[PDB]
DNA sequence: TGCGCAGT
DNA sequence: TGCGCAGT
């Protein structure tokens, strides 16, 4: 019981001092953490054979529910993958808005001794846990509420109700079982706030339930303004970039940064962290790290204005400068970067699909995707701010963020790079 | 028989030396120009009572066809206006693409002694012929082809066929009669090229039939490149402005200026002439000239980039600096403005609706509106260029065009101007 | 799939 | 009305 329960995944090919205190998926599903009865795996991509092999032998026949958003042929492929294992069910989360994804990454782990909730950033495929920087939040072991005891099991941060609303929004019968399981467990120790996105169009007070308006509300109610508030940068850090509009006022600096700079009841610097071509080239994977950084040329050339916000991936602090980011984080550092007002780890990349965007003249928040993250607020630990670990929050990358040099360019996955070979002597030719 | 047959309308309140050689509608429908049998009036707005009173008493019972594009209630109002006059029919030109207008202004004037075609810029309402600068082209009197003579009646410029294709595109039975009438007349003297727009989506070689691609083709085939071609500005001059896109490369400088700078088989300066607020304020009409310059704030604030092309209305040359422009013109002056490579007078304002814009990756030219204009090419008079009248072409405004001062702003019809009174002591409050 | 857009 | 748009 350190306060944050924030971990990185294990990286192959770094010194083992950068992997001590890091978690592989195998560690997470270990018998150490409890005697497993069943599980639910919420994700975007699955390699089903690999996933089963991550569970310990004693636990491989226990019911697994996969919660995915694939349709049609993808769906049929995933069903086919799952066919060999009788213990495995599937739940297709409904995606009624186009270009939506079931992007949330979460494990519900039901044990004989209680319940664990893991919220993280990694797809259920080998490459996502191999040589990338990913983030993980581990809930405590939530004990079961005794049969005749009447308690809510709720925390000051309202995690239990907030999780249940997130699950309730799917409308899925196989998730009813998980909702009932959460109901019977005591989640009162939880010291983080849940930030979910769910697909839809939301009006009035429901705008606050999801996406970046949910973050805004949490910050309004549970953080407080700082003297010189103006000067506390916002830092966003992500692996995919959506179509953000013709200029910054369309969404980024207008409705996204607004929500993010809220504190209690604008020239706030915005630093955006996204790997350069050069970062990808010299990575542990080389150019094929690029396959998980899907910023397409067509999107990029609409929005060249964006790339002057862009800063290098740099992670000397966690030995992970060459372990390309699939983690997404957002945070509110002080101007000197020695402390932070809050920290969010989430599945949500820098997209309107993920965070939400306003339609019909401000009356309506549209969200295409399922997302999930956890907000770390000083107030939930009786503090005003966290010191950055150089009590103190473990920021996985270096501060302050360093601006792309003038020869740098963002990684764009679907053009060739044939001038300089990568780490493994290779070029990149999408095809 | 001066070569151009290009006239301005009569302006009330200027010295009569600026109205000698100018034409009122009454002059155009005069018995002087022939003994009228019937007529067709192509236009956008009609005041039917006023129009009938423009025809001489002897000619008021002769068949008039009105060719309009009104639907629904507008249509019913125009039908009601026309009700009292048994000699008057109507033809509704089909407008299958939204935000299209039947904007063409043309009179077909059938006489006992032959046929006249008038192509011009004025709506058939009193205010359009009162104190505005408008343009008129008068065809010669085309004699009838004798019954057993076999001649085409065509000109070197292909006017007759080109007019007939324009009329044929309406698909209107009441226009069949006019097509047959044009067929029986000799139009061989015509020394101008017809430039039409008609509504639709046009592919392949049909892209060249209409709008700005029609202008491009004419310029390719019948003008020739100039030494220093690069440096001959393009001048556009209009009374309405459409939505041209988020920046200049979207249409204006990409496909519109391209068509306009074509000469035979880019840093070409583009000068756009459009009345400032100050031009409208001190006009003969004052702020109500604004009612015919319908550039709305919503369109303007999307495209502030445009307004650095904007130049004042100035017309000392024709005594018409205070007679606000409803004429539209485009032309190709030399760098010193002493001569021009060509001149176009037309109904088409600075809009994609009018000129056309490419859809589906360059394969398709979409046009919303009916338009019509006449192109004056030196080659059709055996010349290489026209000297500007200061043989020589009568440019109705001053050269070179003068840039908006830094306190000037474009006229925008639907915001208030309440700081400085106009010519008649009034303010402007749309409402 | 449904939003936002487009005249004189 | 029909075009262009929008994910990881």
Coordinates of C-alpha atoms in Angstrom, one line a residue, chain B residues 226-234 266-269 271 332-337:
Chain B
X226 CA 1.8 37.4 -73.5
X227 CA 5.5 38.0 -72.8
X228 CA 5.6 38.5 -69.1
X229 CA 2.1 36.8 -68.9
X230 CA 2.9 36.2 -65.2
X231 CA 2.5 39.9 -64.4
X232 CA -0.9 40.7 -65.9
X233 CA -3.2 41.0 -62.9
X234 CA -6.7 39.5 -62.8
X266 CA 1.5 31.4 -59.9
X267 CA 2.1 35.0 -58.6
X268 CA -0.5 36.6 -60.9
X269 CA -1.9 39.4 -58.7
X271 CA -7.5 42.4 -57.3
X332 CA -7.1 40.9 -67.5
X333 CA -5.2 44.2 -67.4
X334 CA -1.6 44.7 -68.3
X335 CA 0.7 45.5 -65.3
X336 CA 0.5 49.2 -66.1
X337 CA -3.3 49.1 -66.6

